[PDB]
Amino acid sequence: QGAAQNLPADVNQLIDQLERHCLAPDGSLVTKSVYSDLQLAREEMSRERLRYLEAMAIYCEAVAMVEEYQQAISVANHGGIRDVQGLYPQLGLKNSPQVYE
Amino acid sequence: SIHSNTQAGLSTYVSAPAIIQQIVALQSDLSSLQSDLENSLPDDRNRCINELCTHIQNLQQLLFASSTTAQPILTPWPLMKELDEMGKINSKLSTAVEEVTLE
Amino acid sequence: DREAALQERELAAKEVERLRNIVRRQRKDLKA
Amino acid sequence: DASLASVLESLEFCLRVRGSEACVLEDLAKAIDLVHIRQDLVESGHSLLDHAFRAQQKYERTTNYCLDLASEQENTISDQWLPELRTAVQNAQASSEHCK
Amino acid sequence: EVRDATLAHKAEALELQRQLRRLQTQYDLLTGQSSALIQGRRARVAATSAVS
Amino acid sequence: AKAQKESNALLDYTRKAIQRLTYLKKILAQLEDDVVPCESQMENWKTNLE
Amino acid sequence: IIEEIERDEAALREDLYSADRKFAEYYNVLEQILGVLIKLVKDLKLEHQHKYN
Predict the structure, then answer these.
(1) Which helix (H) or strand (E) covers residue D89, if one does?
(2) Which of B76, D51, F29, F40 has its CA 20 to 30 A from that of C18?
(3) Where are the alpha helices (DSSP H) in D2-76?
(4) What is d(CA G29, CA A55) in angstroms, rounded to the nearest whole number?
(5) Phi and psi, residue B102, nearest 5°
(6) E51 contacts in chain A (CB < 8 Å)
(7) Which one-letter DSSP state was computed for residue G46?
(8) CA-derived radius of gyration, chain B
(9) Which residue of C20, C23, C27, C30 is the best one to mutate when testing the D interface, meaning the one whose CB has the most D CBs within 10 A?
C-alpha cells in the first residue's frame, strides 16, 4: 500500500529531473523557447515596447489632436449639445494642430 | 506534465489543428494528482499516519509494556525463576556439580 | 514547554480550516 | 486559444487562476527554472502520502519489529501460559511440599 | 514533543497566512485593475466613426 | 492545505516521537541493557553445554 | 515578478516540502533508537531473548 502511494510521485520523478537537461532539446523548447530565447518577448525591454509606450504620448491625445477637427464638425451634426463646445476643444484648444496638420 | 518529456514539445503544433485535445490533456495531467493525491491525502493519512499516530504513543508506554514486558515477561513472567534460578544451579553451580564428583 | 506548545498548536492548526474555504471562494472569483 | 489557456485547468481548479495568463509574465523563462527543482523533488513534495508510509515501512515497521514483534513471539504463547502455568505452578507446589 | 509539532503546525499556519492577505488585497485591488484601461475606449473610438 | 496541512496535523504525533521515540531510544536501550543477561543463556551457556 | 513568480512557485513548492523537513526530524528519531545497532535491535530487539524467548 505504501509503495502504491509513492507511485504517482515515483512516475513523476523518472523524467522530472532529466527534464532540466531535456529543456534544451525540443521536448520543451516548442513552448519553453522563451528561456532559450531569454525572455522571448523582446529580451525584456530595451527599445521595442519603448516605441509603443512612446505612442501613449501620441495615439492617446496627441493623435486626438488632428482627428479633433473632424470630430468638431462631426459633433456639429449629431451631437448638437457639444456643437458649441466643438470649436473651443478643436478650433481653439487644438488650434495648435493647424501647423502640425 | 514534466513527468512526460514531450509535454511541451508537442502542445503548440497540435493545438492549432486540434484545440480540444491538448488543453484537456494538461488538465488531466495536473488533475492526476489533485484528486489522486491532493484530495486523497485527507483520506489516506487517516490510515497511514493513523497507524503512525497510534503506534508512536503505543510504542512508548503501552506497546512498550507489550515489548519490554513481552519477551522476558509475556511468556516468561513465571519463567524468570526458570530463567535465573535455572542459571543459578545448572549454569552458576554448574561447575559446582563437578565438586561432588571431584571430591 | 509541551503545554505551552499545545495551546499554540491548535491555533496554528485552526487556521487551516479558515484558510481553505475562503481561498476556495476568492481566488476562484478573482478570475471573472 | 486565449480563452482555453486560462480555462485550461478547470478540473485542476488550483492551477486555473494560477494558469490563467501565466506565460504572459514571461515566467516560462523564469518559473520554468522553478518547476524543474519542484518536479525532481516530487519524490518528497507530492510523495508525503508515502513519506508517512516511508516513516512506517522504512523505520516504524522496524520499531514494530522492535515493539510489536517483541510480543509476536509471545502473544500466541500467552494462551500457552495456562499449560505453562501447570509446568510452573508445579514448581509452586514444590515450594508447598517443603512447607511441611 | 508538541514543540516539534509546533514547527509542523506553525508551518501549518504561517505558510497559509501570507496568502489570505494576498487574496483579500486581490479582492480589493483586482476588482478595478482591469477597469484601469477601459476608460481609454472613448478616446480611441471617437474618430473611428469619422474617417469611415 | 489539503495535501500536507491535513497530514501535518496528523504528523504532529510523529513530531511527538521526539518524546515518544526518543523514549524508544531508551526502549531500544533499556531492553538492549537486558541483552547482556539474555546473552548469558546462550553465549555463556554455550560453554555450559560441555 | 521575480520574487512573486518564485513565491507563486514556493506557494506550492516549499509548502509541500514543509512536512518533508519534518519527516526528516521524524526519520532520525525513527533511526536514532539505538542507531549504532538498529538492525540487530530491530529483528530481535533483545539480541538474545528473541533468540531464546
Answers:
(1) helix D77-97
(2) D51
(3) 2-6, 13-16, 32-39, 48-54, 61-66, 69-72
(4) 65
(5) -70, -45
(6) 67, 70
(7) S
(8) 33
(9) C27
DSSP structure class, residue D57: I
* Helix/strand/coil for E51: helix
Closest by Cβ to F23, choosing from B38, B60, B91: B60
Q: How far apart are CA D41 and CA D38, in angstroms?
A: 5
CB A85: neighbour CB atoms within 10 A?
A: 13
How many residues are present in chain C?
32
Q: Is E1–F1 a contact, with Cβ atoms under 8 angstroms apart?
A: no
Task: Indicate the helix (H) or strand (E) that contains A85.
Answer: helix A83-86
CA distance D39 to E6: 28
CB A61 within 8 A of CB E42: no
G25 phi, psi to nearest 5 deg: -65, -20
Output the nine-digit C-alpha cell for E21: 492577505
Q: Residue G51: closest CA among chain B residues belongs to which residue?
A: B71
Q: How many other β-carbons are positioned within 10 Å of the β-carbon of residue A66? A: 15
Chains that touch G (3 or more CB pairs under 8 A): B, D, E, F
Cα gap D65→D56, rounded to integer Å = 11
- Residue type at F19 in one-letter notation: Q
Q: How far apart are CA B76 and CA F34, in angstroms?
A: 14
In chain E, which residues have their Cβ closer than 8 Å to the Cβ of C7? Answer: none
Determine E/C contact with 3+ CB pairs under 8 A as the test. Answer: yes
Distance of residue F47 Cα from the nearest chain D Cα, in angstroms: 26
Number of Cβ within 10 Å of residue D70's Cβ equals 29
Looking at the partner chain, which of A9, A20, A34 has a beta carbon nearest the beta carbon of D50? A9
| CA atoms of A24 and B72, how far apart (whole Å) | 63
Dist. CA B66–CA B81, nearest whole Å: 20
Rg (CA), chain A: 29
B59 CB-near residues (< 8 Å, 6+ apart)? D63, D64, D66, D67, F20, F21, F24, F27
List Cβ neighbours of D70 (8 Å cut-off, separation of 6 or more): B66, B67, B68, B70, B71, F31, G45, G46, G50
Please, what's the b/e burial string for D4-26 (b: 16 or more CB within 10 A of its CB; e: otherwise)?
Answer: ebeebbebbebbbbbbeebbebb
